[PDB]
UniProtKB/Swiss-Prot annotation, chains A, B:
Origin superkingdom: Eukaryota
Disulfide bond positions: 32-58, 36-46, 90-168, 111-151, 139-163
Full protein stretch here: 40 to 208 of 728
Protein name, as recorded: Hepatocyte growth factor alpha chain
PAN domain segment(s): 2-85
Domain named Kringle: residues: 90-168
Amino acid sequence: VHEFKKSAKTTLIKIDPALKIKTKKVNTADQCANRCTRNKGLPFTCKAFVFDKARKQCLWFPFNSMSSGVKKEFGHEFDLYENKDYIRNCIIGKGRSYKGTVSITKSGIKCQPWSSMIPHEHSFLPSSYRGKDLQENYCRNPRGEEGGPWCFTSNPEVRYEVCDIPQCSE
Amino acid sequence: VHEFKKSAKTTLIKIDPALKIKTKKVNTADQCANRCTRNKGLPFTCKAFVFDKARKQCLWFPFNSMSSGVKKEFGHEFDLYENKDYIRNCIIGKGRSYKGTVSITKSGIKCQPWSSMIPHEHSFLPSSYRGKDLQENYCRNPRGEEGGPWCFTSNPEVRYEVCDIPQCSE
Protein backbone atom coordinates (compact mmCIF):
# COMPACT_ATOMS: atom_id res chain seq x y z
CA VAL A 1 0.00 0.00 0.00
CA HIS A 2 3.14 2.17 0.16
CA GLU A 3 3.24 1.82 -3.62
CA PHE A 4 0.48 4.46 -3.65
CA LYS A 5 0.45 8.19 -2.88
CA LYS A 6 -1.77 8.66 0.18
CA SER A 7 -4.01 11.74 0.54
CA ALA A 8 -5.79 11.72 3.91
CA LYS A 9 -9.36 12.85 4.44
CA THR A 10 -9.89 12.82 0.68
CA THR A 11 -12.16 11.14 -1.86
CA LEU A 12 -12.69 11.57 -5.57
CA ILE A 13 -15.78 12.83 -7.40
CA LYS A 14 -16.52 12.65 -11.10
CA ILE A 15 -19.84 13.93 -12.37
CA ASP A 16 -19.64 11.97 -15.61
CA PRO A 17 -21.16 8.43 -15.52
CA ALA A 18 -18.86 7.59 -18.46
CA LEU A 19 -15.79 6.82 -16.35
CA LYS A 20 -16.90 3.56 -14.65
CA ILE A 21 -16.36 2.66 -10.97
CA LYS A 22 -16.28 -0.57 -9.01
CA THR A 23 -16.81 -0.74 -5.24
CA LYS A 24 -16.81 -3.38 -2.50
CA LYS A 25 -15.76 -3.84 1.14
CA VAL A 26 -12.99 -5.06 3.44
CA ASN A 27 -10.96 -5.30 6.61
CA THR A 28 -7.76 -3.24 5.84
CA ALA A 29 -7.17 -0.58 3.16
CA ASP A 30 -4.15 -2.69 2.40
CA GLN A 31 -6.69 -5.10 1.00
CA CYS A 32 -8.02 -2.48 -1.35
CA ALA A 33 -4.52 -1.65 -2.56
CA ASN A 34 -3.21 -5.12 -3.16
CA ARG A 35 -6.36 -5.49 -5.20
CA CYS A 36 -5.92 -2.33 -7.30
CA THR A 37 -2.32 -3.34 -7.92
CA ARG A 38 -3.14 -6.76 -9.32
CA ASN A 39 -6.07 -5.14 -11.08
CA LYS A 40 -7.90 -8.44 -10.33
CA GLY A 41 -11.53 -8.17 -11.46
CA LEU A 42 -11.76 -4.59 -12.69
CA PRO A 43 -13.50 -3.58 -15.97
CA PHE A 44 -10.67 -1.16 -16.24
CA THR A 45 -7.19 -0.12 -15.22
CA CYS A 46 -7.27 0.84 -11.53
CA LYS A 47 -5.29 4.11 -11.16
CA ALA A 48 -6.57 5.05 -7.69
CA PHE A 49 -8.84 3.84 -4.93
CA VAL A 50 -10.50 5.23 -1.85
CA PHE A 51 -10.85 3.50 1.47
CA ASP A 52 -14.08 4.85 2.99
CA LYS A 53 -13.04 3.81 6.49
CA ALA A 54 -16.67 4.57 7.52
CA ARG A 55 -18.33 1.88 5.42
CA LYS A 56 -15.30 -0.48 5.63
CA GLN A 57 -15.24 -0.41 1.77
CA CYS A 58 -13.04 0.31 -1.29
CA LEU A 59 -13.69 2.64 -4.18
CA TRP A 60 -11.68 1.65 -7.26
CA PHE A 61 -11.34 4.15 -10.10
CA PRO A 62 -9.99 4.18 -13.67
CA PHE A 63 -8.57 7.65 -12.93
CA ASN A 64 -7.06 9.84 -10.21
CA SER A 65 -6.94 13.44 -9.01
CA MET A 66 -4.95 14.73 -11.98
CA SER A 67 -7.53 13.23 -14.37
CA SER A 68 -9.74 15.77 -16.20
CA GLY A 69 -13.42 15.66 -15.32
CA VAL A 70 -12.51 14.98 -11.69
CA LYS A 71 -12.23 16.95 -8.44
CA LYS A 72 -11.12 16.24 -4.87
CA GLU A 73 -13.48 16.51 -1.88
CA PHE A 74 -12.74 16.43 1.86
CA GLY A 75 -14.12 13.63 4.02
CA HIS A 76 -12.66 12.61 7.39
CA GLU A 77 -13.65 8.95 6.84
CA PHE A 78 -11.90 8.83 3.48
CA ASP A 79 -8.26 8.25 2.51
CA LEU A 80 -7.28 8.51 -1.19
CA TYR A 81 -4.62 6.23 -2.76
CA GLU A 82 -3.13 6.98 -6.15
CA ASN A 83 -1.27 4.20 -7.98
CA LYS A 84 2.25 5.57 -8.56
CA ASP A 85 2.00 4.14 -12.09
CA TYR A 86 -0.29 6.96 -13.21
CA ILE A 87 1.29 9.96 -11.45
CA ARG A 88 3.81 11.34 -13.93
CA ASN A 89 7.29 10.45 -12.47
CA CYS A 90 9.24 12.83 -14.75
CA ILE A 91 9.26 16.59 -15.11
CA ILE A 92 7.64 19.08 -17.46
CA GLY A 93 9.54 22.35 -17.57
CA LYS A 94 10.63 23.64 -14.15
CA GLY A 95 8.60 20.86 -12.52
CA ARG A 96 6.10 23.40 -11.36
CA SER A 97 3.33 20.75 -11.52
CA TYR A 98 5.23 17.66 -10.28
CA LYS A 99 3.08 15.58 -7.94
CA GLY A 100 5.32 12.51 -7.57
CA THR A 101 6.50 10.83 -4.38
CA VAL A 102 10.25 11.17 -4.53
CA SER A 103 11.14 12.25 -0.96
CA ILE A 104 14.92 12.46 -1.31
CA THR A 105 17.45 15.01 -2.49
CA LYS A 106 20.21 14.44 -5.05
CA SER A 107 22.69 13.41 -2.35
CA GLY A 108 20.15 11.10 -0.75
CA ILE A 109 19.10 13.07 2.31
CA LYS A 110 15.56 12.24 3.44
CA CYS A 111 13.43 15.30 2.81
CA GLN A 112 12.11 17.17 5.86
CA PRO A 113 8.25 17.47 5.90
CA TRP A 114 6.72 20.75 4.61
CA SER A 115 4.60 21.04 7.74
CA SER A 116 7.60 20.52 9.97
CA MET A 117 9.75 23.24 11.44
CA ILE A 118 12.47 20.82 12.54
CA PRO A 119 15.32 20.90 11.86
CA HIS A 120 14.63 23.94 9.66
CA GLU A 121 12.11 26.76 9.96
CA HIS A 122 10.54 27.98 6.73
CA SER A 123 7.47 29.85 5.37
CA PHE A 124 6.50 27.05 2.95
CA LEU A 125 3.60 25.68 4.94
CA PRO A 126 0.76 24.15 2.94
CA SER A 127 -1.61 26.73 4.46
CA SER A 128 0.12 29.61 2.67
CA TYR A 129 0.59 27.82 -0.70
CA ARG A 130 -2.46 26.04 -2.20
CA GLY A 131 -2.89 23.29 -4.75
CA LYS A 132 0.86 23.12 -4.44
CA ASP A 133 0.68 19.71 -2.78
CA LEU A 134 3.24 20.53 -0.09
CA GLN A 135 2.42 17.34 1.77
CA GLU A 136 4.53 14.79 3.61
CA ASN A 137 8.06 15.37 2.44
CA TYR A 138 7.63 15.18 -1.30
CA CYS A 139 9.98 17.12 -3.56
CA ARG A 140 8.03 20.02 -5.00
CA ASN A 141 8.64 23.34 -6.70
CA PRO A 142 5.95 25.65 -5.19
CA ARG A 143 7.53 28.74 -6.76
CA GLY A 144 8.20 27.04 -10.06
CA GLU A 145 11.83 28.10 -9.70
CA GLU A 146 14.77 27.09 -11.88
CA GLY A 147 16.22 24.21 -9.90
CA GLY A 148 13.02 22.24 -10.14
CA PRO A 149 11.50 20.17 -7.34
CA TRP A 150 13.39 20.54 -4.11
CA CYS A 151 12.81 20.08 -0.43
CA PHE A 152 14.09 21.03 2.97
CA THR A 153 16.55 18.51 4.38
CA SER A 154 16.26 16.22 7.42
CA ASN A 155 19.83 17.19 8.03
CA PRO A 156 20.80 20.24 10.21
CA GLU A 157 23.93 20.82 8.09
CA VAL A 158 21.72 21.32 5.06
CA ARG A 159 18.60 23.51 4.97
CA TYR A 160 17.52 22.57 1.46
CA GLU A 161 18.58 20.71 -1.69
CA VAL A 162 17.22 20.14 -5.17
CA CYS A 163 15.99 16.54 -5.80
CA ASP A 164 17.02 14.27 -8.65
CA ILE A 165 14.02 13.95 -10.96
CA PRO A 166 14.38 13.64 -14.77
CA GLN A 167 12.70 15.83 -17.38
CA CYS A 168 10.14 13.82 -19.30
CA SER A 169 12.30 14.70 -22.34
CA GLU A 170 14.83 12.63 -20.34
CA VAL B 1 11.74 -7.24 -5.65
CA HIS B 2 8.31 -7.04 -7.29
CA GLU B 3 8.51 -3.31 -7.90
CA PHE B 4 11.71 -3.58 -9.95
CA LYS B 5 12.12 -4.33 -13.64
CA LYS B 6 14.65 -7.14 -13.77
CA SER B 7 17.27 -7.84 -16.46
CA ALA B 8 19.09 -11.16 -16.11
CA LYS B 9 22.85 -11.58 -16.65
CA THR B 10 23.26 -7.82 -16.73
CA THR B 11 25.25 -5.34 -14.67
CA LEU B 12 26.16 -1.71 -15.20
CA ILE B 13 29.43 0.20 -15.61
CA LYS B 14 29.84 3.93 -15.10
CA ILE B 15 31.79 5.62 -17.91
CA ASP B 16 31.59 8.70 -15.66
CA PRO B 17 34.35 8.74 -13.00
CA ALA B 18 31.96 11.05 -11.19
CA LEU B 19 28.96 8.70 -10.70
CA LYS B 20 29.18 6.99 -7.31
CA ILE B 21 28.01 3.61 -6.06
CA LYS B 22 27.64 1.59 -2.89
CA THR B 23 28.03 -2.13 -2.33
CA LYS B 24 27.53 -4.61 0.52
CA LYS B 25 27.50 -8.39 1.10
CA VAL B 26 24.03 -9.83 1.44
CA ASN B 27 22.27 -13.19 1.23
CA THR B 28 19.59 -12.46 -1.40
CA ALA B 29 18.62 -10.03 -4.14
CA ASP B 30 15.46 -9.52 -2.07
CA GLN B 31 17.30 -7.71 0.72
CA CYS B 32 18.86 -5.30 -1.78
CA ALA B 33 15.55 -4.23 -3.33
CA ASN B 34 14.26 -3.29 0.10
CA ARG B 35 17.04 -0.88 0.98
CA CYS B 36 16.68 0.70 -2.49
CA THR B 37 12.91 1.23 -2.53
CA ARG B 38 13.13 2.70 0.95
CA ASN B 39 16.23 4.53 -0.31
CA LYS B 40 17.71 3.90 3.14
CA GLY B 41 21.29 4.74 4.05
CA LEU B 42 22.20 5.80 0.55
CA PRO B 43 24.25 8.86 -0.35
CA PHE B 44 21.86 9.25 -3.27
CA THR B 45 18.62 8.60 -5.16
CA CYS B 46 18.81 4.80 -5.75
CA LYS B 47 17.61 4.30 -9.37
CA ALA B 48 18.73 0.65 -9.62
CA PHE B 49 20.68 -2.15 -7.98
CA VAL B 50 22.45 -5.25 -9.22
CA PHE B 51 22.82 -8.45 -7.30
CA ASP B 52 25.86 -10.66 -7.61
CA LYS B 53 24.82 -14.28 -7.30
CA ALA B 54 28.47 -15.29 -7.14
CA ARG B 55 29.90 -13.05 -4.46
CA LYS B 56 26.48 -12.43 -2.88
CA GLN B 57 26.41 -8.62 -2.88
CA CYS B 58 24.35 -5.61 -3.89
CA LEU B 59 25.43 -2.61 -5.87
CA TRP B 60 22.99 0.29 -5.47
CA PHE B 61 23.29 2.93 -8.23
CA PRO B 62 22.08 6.56 -8.75
CA PHE B 63 21.34 5.64 -12.37
CA ASN B 64 19.73 2.93 -14.44
CA SER B 65 20.26 1.44 -17.91
CA MET B 66 18.88 4.60 -19.52
CA SER B 67 21.21 7.02 -17.69
CA SER B 68 23.70 8.66 -20.06
CA GLY B 69 26.67 8.01 -17.78
CA VAL B 70 26.38 4.24 -18.23
CA LYS B 71 26.39 1.22 -20.49
CA LYS B 72 25.49 -2.38 -19.67
CA GLU B 73 27.77 -5.39 -19.96
CA PHE B 74 27.12 -9.12 -19.81
CA GLY B 75 27.77 -11.22 -16.70
CA HIS B 76 26.25 -14.57 -15.76
CA GLU B 77 26.36 -13.83 -12.02
CA PHE B 78 24.56 -10.50 -12.36
CA ASP B 79 20.92 -9.50 -12.23
CA LEU B 80 19.91 -5.90 -12.66
CA TYR B 81 16.82 -4.44 -10.99
CA GLU B 82 15.52 -1.02 -12.03
CA ASN B 83 13.05 0.78 -9.79
CA LYS B 84 9.74 1.67 -11.48
CA ASP B 85 9.97 5.10 -9.87
CA TYR B 86 12.67 6.24 -12.27
CA ILE B 87 11.54 4.61 -15.49
CA ARG B 88 9.34 7.11 -17.31
CA ASN B 89 5.70 6.08 -16.82
CA CYS B 90 4.19 8.40 -19.47
CA ILE B 91 4.29 8.22 -23.27
CA ILE B 92 6.44 10.26 -25.62
CA GLY B 93 4.54 10.68 -28.85
CA LYS B 94 3.50 7.29 -30.22
CA GLY B 95 5.26 5.22 -27.57
CA ARG B 96 7.73 3.00 -29.43
CA SER B 97 10.19 3.75 -26.60
CA TYR B 98 7.91 3.06 -23.64
CA LYS B 99 9.71 0.89 -21.09
CA GLY B 100 7.34 0.97 -18.15
CA THR B 101 5.92 -2.04 -16.43
CA VAL B 102 2.25 -1.43 -17.00
CA SER B 103 0.89 -4.80 -18.13
CA ILE B 104 -2.87 -4.38 -18.12
CA THR B 105 -5.10 -3.35 -21.04
CA LYS B 106 -7.28 -0.23 -21.30
CA SER B 107 -10.09 -2.44 -19.98
CA GLY B 108 -8.56 -4.43 -17.09
CA ILE B 109 -7.29 -7.65 -18.56
CA LYS B 110 -3.81 -8.86 -17.75
CA CYS B 111 -1.48 -9.00 -20.69
CA GLN B 112 -0.44 -12.31 -22.14
CA PRO B 113 3.35 -12.68 -21.95
CA TRP B 114 5.20 -11.90 -25.24
CA SER B 115 7.25 -15.07 -25.29
CA SER B 116 4.13 -17.13 -24.97
CA MET B 117 1.85 -18.49 -27.69
CA ILE B 118 -1.13 -19.03 -25.38
CA PRO B 119 -3.87 -17.97 -25.49
CA HIS B 120 -2.68 -16.20 -28.62
CA GLU B 121 -0.16 -17.13 -31.27
CA HIS B 122 1.98 -14.37 -32.75
CA SER B 123 5.42 -13.55 -34.17
CA PHE B 124 6.21 -10.65 -31.87
CA LEU B 125 9.25 -12.29 -30.35
CA PRO B 126 12.12 -10.16 -28.99
CA SER B 127 14.22 -11.84 -31.66
CA SER B 128 12.40 -9.86 -34.29
CA TYR B 129 12.25 -6.74 -32.20
CA ARG B 130 15.56 -5.90 -30.61
CA GLY B 131 15.68 -2.66 -28.62
CA LYS B 132 11.89 -2.99 -28.23
CA ASP B 133 11.83 -4.60 -24.75
CA LEU B 134 9.13 -7.22 -25.43
CA GLN B 135 9.78 -8.90 -22.09
CA GLU B 136 7.46 -10.37 -19.44
CA ASN B 137 3.95 -9.19 -20.29
CA TYR B 138 4.57 -5.45 -20.60
CA CYS B 139 2.48 -3.18 -22.80
CA ARG B 140 4.68 -2.23 -25.75
CA ASN B 141 4.61 -0.42 -29.09
CA PRO B 142 7.25 -2.26 -31.25
CA ARG B 143 5.81 -0.88 -34.48
CA GLY B 144 5.15 2.66 -33.27
CA GLU B 145 1.64 2.22 -34.67
CA GLU B 146 -0.71 5.10 -33.85
CA GLY B 147 -2.63 3.09 -31.26
CA GLY B 148 -0.04 3.45 -28.53
CA PRO B 149 1.62 0.70 -26.46
CA TRP B 150 -0.59 -2.40 -26.54
CA CYS B 151 -0.51 -6.12 -25.71
CA PHE B 152 -1.82 -9.62 -26.43
CA THR B 153 -4.52 -10.41 -23.81
CA SER B 154 -4.76 -13.29 -21.33
CA ASN B 155 -8.46 -13.35 -22.24
CA PRO B 156 -8.97 -15.81 -25.20
CA GLU B 157 -11.85 -13.62 -26.37
CA VAL B 158 -9.56 -10.61 -26.82
CA ARG B 159 -6.43 -11.06 -28.87
CA TYR B 160 -4.82 -7.68 -28.21
CA GLU B 161 -5.83 -4.35 -26.72
CA VAL B 162 -4.27 -0.95 -26.22
CA CYS B 163 -3.06 0.06 -22.76
CA ASP B 164 -4.21 3.11 -20.74
CA ILE B 165 -0.83 4.90 -20.89
CA PRO B 166 -0.92 8.68 -20.32
CA GLN B 167 0.77 11.05 -22.74
CA CYS B 168 3.59 13.02 -21.08
CA SER B 169 2.68 16.57 -22.13
CA GLU B 170 -1.12 16.28 -22.47
